[PDB]
Amino acid sequence: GKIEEGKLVIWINGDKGYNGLAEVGKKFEKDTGIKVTVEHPDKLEEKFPQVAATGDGPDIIFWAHDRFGGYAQSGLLAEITPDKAFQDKLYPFTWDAVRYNGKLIAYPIAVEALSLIYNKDLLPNPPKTWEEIPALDKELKAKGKSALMFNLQEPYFTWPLIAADGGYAFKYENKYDIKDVGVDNAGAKAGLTFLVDLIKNKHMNADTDYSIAEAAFNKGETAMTINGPWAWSNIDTSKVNYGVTVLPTFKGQPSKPFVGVLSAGINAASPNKELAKEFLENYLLTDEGLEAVNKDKPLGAVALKSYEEELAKDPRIAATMENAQKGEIMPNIPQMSAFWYAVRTAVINAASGRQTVDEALKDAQTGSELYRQSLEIISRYLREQATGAADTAPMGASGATSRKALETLRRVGDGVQRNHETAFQGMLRKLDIKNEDDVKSLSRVMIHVFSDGVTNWGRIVTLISFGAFVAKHLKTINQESCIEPLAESITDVLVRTKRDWLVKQRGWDGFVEFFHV
Numbered sequence: 001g002k003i004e005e006g007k008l009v010i011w012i013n014g015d016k017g018y019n020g021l022a023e024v025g026k027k028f029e030k031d032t033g034i035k036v037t038v039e040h041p042d043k044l045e046e047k048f049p050q051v052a053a054t055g056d057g058p059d060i061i062f063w064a065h066d067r068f069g070g071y072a073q074s075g076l077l078a079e080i081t082p083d084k085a086f087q088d089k090l091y092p093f094t095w096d097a098v099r100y101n102g103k104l105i106a107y108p109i110a111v112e113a114l115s116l117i118y119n120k121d122l123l124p125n126p127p128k129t130w131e132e133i134p135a136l137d138k139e140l141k142a143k144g145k146s147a148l149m150f151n152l153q154e155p156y157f158t159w160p161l162i163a164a165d166g167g168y169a170f171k172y173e174n175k176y177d178i179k180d181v182g183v184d185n186a187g188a189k190a191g192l193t194f195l196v197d198l199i200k201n202k203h204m205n206a207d208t209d210y211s212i213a214e215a216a217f218n219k220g221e222t223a224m225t226i227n228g229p230w231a232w233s234n235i236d237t238s239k240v241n242y243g244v245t246v247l248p249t250f251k252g253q254p255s256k257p258f259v260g261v262l263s264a265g266i267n268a269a270s271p272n273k274e275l276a277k278e279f280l281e282n283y284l285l286t287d288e289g290l291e292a293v294n295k296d297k298p299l300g301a302v303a304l305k306s307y308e309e310e311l312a313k314d315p316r317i318a319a320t321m322e323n324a325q326k327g328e329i330m331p332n333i334p335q336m337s338a339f340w341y342a343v344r345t346a347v348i349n350a351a352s353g354r355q356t357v358d359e360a361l362k363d364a365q366t367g368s369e370l371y372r373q374s375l376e377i378i379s380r381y382l383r384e385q386a387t388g389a390a391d392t393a394p395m396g397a398s399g400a401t402s403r404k405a406l407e408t409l410r411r412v413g414d415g416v417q418r419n420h421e422t423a424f425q426g427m428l429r430k431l432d433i434k435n436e437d438d439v440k441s442l443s444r445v446m447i448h449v450f451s452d453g454v455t456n457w458g459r460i461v462t463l464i465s466f467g468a469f470v471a472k473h474l475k476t477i478n479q480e481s482c483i484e485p486l487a488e489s490i491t492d493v494l495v496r497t498k499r500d501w502l503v504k505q506r507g508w509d510g511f512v513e514f515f516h517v
């Protein structure tokens with residue numbers, strides 16, 4: 001139901017120092033009498049947006065910064081307004097990671113990058129290249145060991161290799177070009193082909209997950225793993241003689257890990273926002289607060305300058321920041337969730353042999369592009385229907401598909417508006433859409449109606465065609481400013497409800513083919 005006033009509920013991932021965070025919670029309770037409950041639910045990054053949308057969930061959510069732009073866009077996060085004195089205590093680049101549309105939407109905690117972790121008793125010198133790992137595995141298999149095991153179920157761990165020879169998520173030049181996705185280029189293919197060849201040649205197993213890789217490294221059965229600072233605690237307990245070092249190069253180029261800033265957001269529906277701010281600023285983001293978490297599971301390079309100066313002498317942190325420098329700080333754009341879902345499926349299907357590398361990355365490209373391509377088509381159709389004049393701007397990336405989808409939608413959507421004028425006029429009058437607040441109300445009812453019953457291109461045409469019908473109404477009553485929000489809302493409904501179906505149709509190319517006369 002509603003978040004309980006007078007306590008704090010905190011969500012953090014089960015691989016992080018949640019017992020250390022609970023100790024900070026106990027210090028908070030000692031001062032204030034306010035009880036702090038720390039939970040680590042499974043899939044909390046997927047659960048948070050579901051429960052927070054209903055005004056429920058934790059007061060504070062911890063995740064890497066990449067997921068907070070989506071949460072902020074969805075209205076699920078309170079704006080963070082620390083004073084200059086507090087802001088100056090953290091590195092400016094960490095605040096940049098938690099800025100979305102010019103507003104701070106979380107507190108940055110620590111910088112995370114993957115490193116190569118190696119067993120000095122099996123491999124005194126780690127391999128500098130991915131290319132030498134097959135030969136090393138052959139040497140180690142003769143000793144009853146293997147070279148490398150890491151999580152193949154989460155694309156976070158394979159991304160550094162995919163990115164090495166030129167794979168990218170969203171092109172960054174000067175600003176992100178969200179229309180420019182680098183998932184199915186020659187560089188991405190080269191990296192994922194290398195991983196699949198390691199599996200084909202029995203150097204790795206497609207079924208290896210976080211738990212299997214951690215157990216094999218910590219038992220001394222595999223010489224190397226790929227993991228973040230949080231993993232170091234369990235390796236210390238195992239008494240493995242380990243090193244943390246630069247990831248291997250691929251085709252002479254560095255592995256490029258996607259760099260995360262562990263961040264703490266405040267639930268927009270929390271009645272405990274002042275308690276949450278007090279906890280995060282004056283208990284957690286202190287030398288003693290971060291020490292308590294770091295002693296449980298290491299954070300990496302903490303955002304708090306005073307404590308980072310103390311930790312920076314650690315060679316494992318130096319290695320973390322060397323890999324971070326060769327990588328890229330993740331975007332926080334709302335499309336990151338879709339990007340990760342698309343690439344997760346691609347790596348798992350390529351690794352298992354369900355798809356070829358070409359097939360897998362083609363689907364991942366379509367899934368990653370789906371929101372922005374859908375919005376380009378739907379925004380243009382609604383606006384030209386409302387105003388009577390087309391947009392002269394270039395379509396940009398995958399422009400032929402956008403142009404031909406808009407041409408098709410002009411033919412079939414104009415026909416739907418003509419033939420279903422009665423139902424459209426009746427429903428427009430019942431909805432009584434007057435302003436941007438009324439447009440924002442449509443999402444819930446649209447999802448309900450559209451998600452029920454059969455999936456086909458005709459119902460997608462009806463969804464967008466009624467959008468155009470509403471947009472014409474909005475322009476006429478001098479609410480033209482409502483049209484882009486309406487287009488965004490319809491696009492969100494379409495892509496969230498029909499993601500998997502749309503990718504199976506080759507997205508908008510399927511639409512053009514389906515309605516080809």
Ligand SMILES: COCCOCc1nn(C)c2c1CSCc1cc(n(C)n1)CCc1cc(c3ccc(F)cc3c1)OCCCc1c(C(=O)O)n(C)c3c-2c(Cl)ccc13
Nearest residue numbers: 420422423424426427445446449450459462463466467470
């Ligand atoms: C006077 O005669 C009566 C006969 O009428 C029967 C009929 N025939 N037709 C064609 C539709 C209907 C009503 S029953 C479906 C319905 C629609 C709504 N409610 C509450 N119920 C309003 C909530 C809503 C739903 C939207 C919206 C999309 C863009 C937008 F800007 C605002 C939207 C608001 O999209 C749902 C999926 C697309 C859709 C479909 C579909 O999926 O097939 N149908 C059948 C629609 C009908 C209408 Cl009028 C509008 C849209 C659809």
Ligand SMILES: OC[C@H]1O[C@H](O[C@H]2[C@H](O)[C@@H](O)[C@@H](O)O[C@@H]2CO)[C@H](O)[C@@H](O)[C@@H]1O
Nearest residue numbers: 013015064066067112154155156260340
């Ligand atoms: O695998 C995709 C996944 O990558 C990142 O998640 C990391 C997280 O940042 C780390 O702190 C650690 O918990 O491992 C996770 C990988 O299992 C992204 O932050 C996440 O959004 C994305 O889904």
